[PDB]
Enzyme design. Sequence first.
Site, PDB file in Angstrom:
ATOM      1  N   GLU A  76       0.756  -1.295  -0.133  1.00 54.87           N
ATOM      2  CA  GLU A  76      -0.039   0.008   0.136  1.00 54.87           C
ATOM      3  C   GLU A  76       0.839   1.236   0.227  1.00 54.87           C
ATOM      4  O   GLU A  76       0.590   2.236  -0.697  1.00 54.87           O
ATOM      5  CB  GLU A  76      -0.874   0.089   1.366  1.00 54.87           C
ATOM      6  CG  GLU A  76      -1.935   1.238   1.128  1.00 54.87           C
ATOM      7  CD  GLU A  76      -2.418   1.275   2.386  1.00 54.87           C
ATOM      8  OE1 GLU A  76      -1.834   1.442   3.473  1.00 54.87           O
ATOM      9  OE2 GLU A  76      -3.980   1.730   2.621  1.00 54.87           O
TER      10      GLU A  76
ATOM     11  N   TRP B 228      -8.468  -1.725  -0.191  1.00 53.01           N
ATOM     12  CA  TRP B 228      -9.373  -0.714  -0.842  1.00 53.01           C
ATOM     13  C   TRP B 228     -10.511  -1.226  -1.705  1.00 53.01           C
ATOM     14  O   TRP B 228     -11.295  -0.115  -2.261  1.00 53.01           O
ATOM     15  CB  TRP B 228      -8.155   0.461  -1.443  1.00 53.01           C
ATOM     16  CG  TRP B 228      -7.331   1.196  -0.533  1.00 53.01           C
ATOM     17  CD1 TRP B 228      -6.141   0.637  -0.184  1.00 53.01           C
ATOM     18  CD2 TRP B 228      -7.448   2.010   0.154  1.00 53.01           C
ATOM     19  NE1 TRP B 228      -5.467   1.545   0.693  1.00 53.01           N
ATOM     20  CE2 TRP B 228      -6.319   2.689   0.726  1.00 53.01           C
ATOM     21  CE3 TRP B 228      -8.611   3.317   0.017  1.00 53.01           C
ATOM     22  CZ2 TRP B 228      -6.176   3.775   1.578  1.00 53.01           C
ATOM     23  CZ3 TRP B 228      -8.444   4.381   0.998  1.00 53.01           C
ATOM     24  CH2 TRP B 228      -7.145   4.742   1.571  1.00 53.01           C
TER      25      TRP B 228
ATOM     26  N   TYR C  81      -4.613   8.771  -0.970  1.00 57.71           N
ATOM     27  CA  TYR C  81      -3.228   9.540  -0.488  1.00 57.71           C
ATOM     28  C   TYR C  81      -2.321   9.682  -1.649  1.00 57.71           C
ATOM     29  O   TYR C  81      -1.469  10.531  -1.608  1.00 57.71           O
ATOM     30  CB  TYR C  81      -2.524   8.427   0.579  1.00 57.71           C
ATOM     31  CG  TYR C  81      -3.494   8.563   1.908  1.00 57.71           C
ATOM     32  CD1 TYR C  81      -3.434   9.565   2.773  1.00 57.71           C
ATOM     33  CD2 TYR C  81      -4.491   7.670   2.026  1.00 57.71           C
ATOM     34  CE1 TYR C  81      -4.037   9.914   3.993  1.00 57.71           C
ATOM     35  CE2 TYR C  81      -5.080   7.615   3.324  1.00 57.71           C
ATOM     36  CZ  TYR C  81      -4.898   8.812   4.112  1.00 57.71           C
ATOM     37  OH  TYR C  81      -5.852   8.992   5.352  1.00 57.71           O
TER      38      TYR C  81
ATOM     39  N   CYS D 259      -7.886  10.363   7.119  1.00 59.38           N
ATOM     40  CA  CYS D 259      -7.629   9.965   8.687  1.00 59.38           C
ATOM     41  C   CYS D 259      -6.253  10.593   9.124  1.00 59.38           C
ATOM     42  O   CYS D 259      -6.205  11.177  10.045  1.00 59.38           O
ATOM     43  CB  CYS D 259      -7.468   8.409   8.958  1.00 59.38           C
ATOM     44  SG  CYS D 259      -9.255   7.729   8.877  1.00 59.38           S
TER      45      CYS D 259
ATOM     46  N   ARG E 164      -6.563  12.479  12.466  1.00 61.26           N
ATOM     47  CA  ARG E 164      -7.791  13.049  13.027  1.00 61.26           C
ATOM     48  C   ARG E 164      -8.690  12.054  13.525  1.00 61.26           C
ATOM     49  O   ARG E 164      -9.352  12.192  14.582  1.00 61.26           O
ATOM     50  CB  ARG E 164      -8.511  13.818  12.231  1.00 61.26           C
ATOM     51  CG  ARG E 164      -8.321  13.821  10.813  1.00 61.26           C
ATOM     52  CD  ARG E 164      -9.477  12.605  10.030  1.00 61.26           C
ATOM     53  NE  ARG E 164     -10.703  12.833  10.336  1.00 61.26           N
ATOM     54  CZ  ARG E 164     -11.586  12.212   9.544  1.00 61.26           C
ATOM     55  NH1 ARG E 164     -11.343  11.188   8.711  1.00 61.26           N
ATOM     56  NH2 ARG E 164     -12.971  12.652   9.662  1.00 61.26           N
TER      57      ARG E 164
ATOM     58  N   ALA F  85      -8.911   7.660  14.796  1.00 57.76           N
ATOM     59  CA  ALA F  85      -8.245   6.312  14.765  1.00 57.76           C
ATOM     60  C   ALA F  85      -8.997   5.199  15.591  1.00 57.76           C
ATOM     61  O   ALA F  85      -9.744   5.558  16.227  1.00 57.76           O
ATOM     62  CB  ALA F  85      -6.920   6.479  15.645  1.00 57.76           C
ATOM     63  N   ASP F  86      -8.607   4.163  15.105  1.00 52.22           N
ATOM     64  CA  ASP F  86      -9.189   2.884  15.651  1.00 52.22           C
ATOM     65  C   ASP F  86      -8.004   2.107  16.313  1.00 52.22           C
ATOM     66  O   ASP F  86      -7.217   1.819  15.561  1.00 52.22           O
ATOM     67  CB  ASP F  86      -9.709   1.998  14.514  1.00 52.22           C
ATOM     68  CG  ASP F  86     -10.704   0.867  14.882  1.00 52.22           C
ATOM     69  OD1 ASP F  86     -10.363   0.314  16.049  1.00 52.22           O
ATOM     70  OD2 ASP F  86     -11.123   0.335  13.948  1.00 52.22           O
TER      71      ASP F  86
HETATM   72  O1  LIG Z   1      -5.838   3.717   8.420  1.00 44.80           O
HETATM   73  C1  LIG Z   1      -6.873   4.116   8.991  1.00 44.80           C
HETATM   74  C2  LIG Z   1      -8.101   4.203   8.093  1.00 44.80           C
HETATM   75  C3  LIG Z   1      -9.449   4.179   8.873  1.00 44.80           C
HETATM   76  N1  LIG Z   1      -9.131   4.330  10.248  1.00 44.80           N
HETATM   77  C4  LIG Z   1     -10.835   4.456  10.784  1.00 44.80           C
HETATM   78  C5  LIG Z   1     -10.866   5.529  11.975  1.00 44.80           C
HETATM   79  C6  LIG Z   1     -12.198   5.375  12.090  1.00 44.80           C
HETATM   80  O2  LIG Z   1     -12.540   4.125  12.818  1.00 44.80           O
HETATM   81  C7  LIG Z   1     -13.041   5.674  10.699  1.00 44.80           C
HETATM   82  C8  LIG Z   1     -13.052   7.189  10.428  1.00 44.80           C
HETATM   83  O3  LIG Z   1     -13.721   8.174  11.232  1.00 44.80           O
HETATM   84  P1  LIG Z   1     -14.851   9.081  10.375  1.00 44.80           P
HETATM   85  O4  LIG Z   1     -13.781   9.989   9.560  1.00 44.80           O
HETATM   86  O5  LIG Z   1     -15.486   8.261   9.375  1.00 44.80           O
HETATM   87  O6  LIG Z   1     -15.819   9.740  11.292  1.00 44.80           O
HETATM   88  O7  LIG Z   1     -12.153   4.912  10.108  1.00 44.80           O
HETATM   89  C9  LIG Z   1      -8.168   4.153  10.747  1.00 44.80           C
HETATM   90  O8  LIG Z   1      -8.127   4.123  12.117  1.00 44.80           O
HETATM   91  N2  LIG Z   1      -6.932   3.875  10.169  1.00 44.80           N
END
Ligand SMILES: O=c1ccn([C@H]2C[C@H](O)[C@@H](COP(=O)(O)O)O2)c(=O)[nH]1
Lengths: 316, 316
Positions: free
Chosen positions: B60, B82, B146, B198, B218, B220-221
């Site tokens: 990626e 993706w 990106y 993100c 902004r 994160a999971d």
């Molecule tokens: O590299 C990545 C891609 C996606 N998400 C996540 C974060 C959130 O769970 C959701 C994005 O939040 P919103 O922008 O949709 O509110 O996707 C990550 O943590 N890391």
Amino acid sequence: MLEQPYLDLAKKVLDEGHFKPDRTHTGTYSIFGHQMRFDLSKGFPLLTTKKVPFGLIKSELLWFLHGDTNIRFLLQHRNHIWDEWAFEKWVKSDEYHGPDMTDFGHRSQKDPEFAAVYHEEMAKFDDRVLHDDAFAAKYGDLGLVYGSQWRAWHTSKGDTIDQLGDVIEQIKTHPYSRRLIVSAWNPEDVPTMALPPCHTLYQFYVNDGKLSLQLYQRSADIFLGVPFCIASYALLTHLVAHECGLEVGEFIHTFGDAHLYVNHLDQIKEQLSRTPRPAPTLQLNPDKHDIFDFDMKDIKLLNYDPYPAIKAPVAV
Amino acid sequence: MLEQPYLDLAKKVLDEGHFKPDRTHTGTYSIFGHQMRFDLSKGFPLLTTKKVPFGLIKSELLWFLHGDTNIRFLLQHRNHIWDEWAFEKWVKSDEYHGPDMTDFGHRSQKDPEFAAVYHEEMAKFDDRVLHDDAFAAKYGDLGLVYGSQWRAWHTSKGDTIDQLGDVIEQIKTHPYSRRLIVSAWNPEDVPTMALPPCHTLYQFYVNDGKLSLQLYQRSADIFLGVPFCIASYALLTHLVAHECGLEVGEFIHTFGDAHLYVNHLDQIKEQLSRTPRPAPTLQLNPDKHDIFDFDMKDIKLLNYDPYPAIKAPVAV
Ligand SMILES: O=c1ccn([C@H]2C[C@H](O)[C@@H](COP(=O)(O)O)O2)c(=O)[nH]1
Ligand SMILES: O=c1ccn([C@H]2C[C@H](O)[C@@H](COP(=O)(O)O)O2)c(=O)[nH]1
């Protein structure tokens, strides 16, 4: 105590820094990456251990909110923070007739004979901008500045975008939105700017009934700028929290490159001698709410009790 | 131990979080504002207490560097991260003929009869994109991703800007530049995007002979994304540090809204049971240097020794 995070930033940059060179040629102790966190519910982060002019932090912010760009509103308020920019421009125009002020704000600090011709033509400029309408429009408008990047982001299909006005809509209708961001960093304009934004971007976030704001400042001056910036934003956090009807949470300040200039060392070193006093208290006009139309009169700083202001030279 | 900062993020979000609602409707414990710091000279931040597929983080990233946007390079590498984006698009086209897959990636996780029709049309898509050239161009290109925001930022005078290629010039000629920033956050495109970035922006910074990178993410999971992201960037920090001829410093990860989904609680809770093992070691092709033209073969992950991978459901 409220401001300790700030004083601790300065010790950390002093007794744990790293020397590095820079644009202006003075020198610096620097560190990279730093988060600091103030709890606005506890008070107002205007430093007590040094006297900061809220007058200046205040008029500049409202300028921003109007989406202005002309130094004329600031001058209107005796606020001269941005003159050296407009001026420089004026100076490099053949409509400018006379004293070729190259590096004016350089030699004027090593040569007191020049510090007089300079400051003379300045009051020429600022008085002209104050009075000659066609001048104010021609030389008084700065162009790309926080106000225009916040409320008039130029698109590629000819239009203006009200970034700040929009995020504010989203806070009411989607208080839980994680996309609530305003950015002043624009790739295409960045390489033709006297000084590309220090305060790169900010993001709000609505925790349980409370509003918080995090700032990403790519370059900071611990001594002269950080004390001002902490307040433009803690102030903005309240203003917004006012319009949206929310309580107020925290101000999270994050830095990329945080520096302390060489010739500021003795001052910060002295400032640390002081013991912080209880922070002031922001009071807002409860009648008016449409923040974009707030005015000086609508803000009040209760209980501020600061230590003497500390004299310090602009490193250039 | 290298990764402790990460595990500590998760405890903090668990035994100190705050419940809040969100876009996908599962639920979350969240916190706002957080900096975490890895010292790449000590190792490579690929988690050991859970098995992460470096294959995916790797292909990626290189996609990104080419400034690609077509899922076709990824599929080429068995990387399907993706697809669900390209697909969705394909699905809402009348050229799409058949099973109106509304919320496909929703019901497919509550209904196993659908998880078969769905995954069937998917291999339809991915095989078509793999083979039908005009399809790959039509439905395989994602557009704003990106890669395009890094190497083709659309301006208002018709041109493309190579943000990442430019910052890299500046690192060689102005290693001390505090303006070395790449941003993927674009105001005008932001309101018409399936998922606005993100990883909002990053800034490099050259300390005494060493390169560092700070990221502002902004959203994160903690469980599923943060382990991947920490490596895309620690990897990027080396790649760049390779081309510029610099040693490698730190990776500073900064978060706005960091969340842990409801139905992931038991897993993270189990993952914390593990005791971290010594981190792997990134090895790069010493012959090639023009990073934009690197290939899988040019990277090597030495000494990785991870705990079993942990099964977990996508909250949607
Ligand atoms: O590299 C990545 C891609 C996606 N998400 C996540 C974060 C959130 O769970 C959701 C994005 O939040 P919103 O922008 O949709 O509110 O996707 C990550 O943590 N890391
Ligand atoms: O609100 C402000 C405005 C300016 N500066 C400073 C930071 C640096 O001293 C210089 C900007 O660094 P460069 O972008 O020029 O490298 O101006 C601040 O700290 N705060």
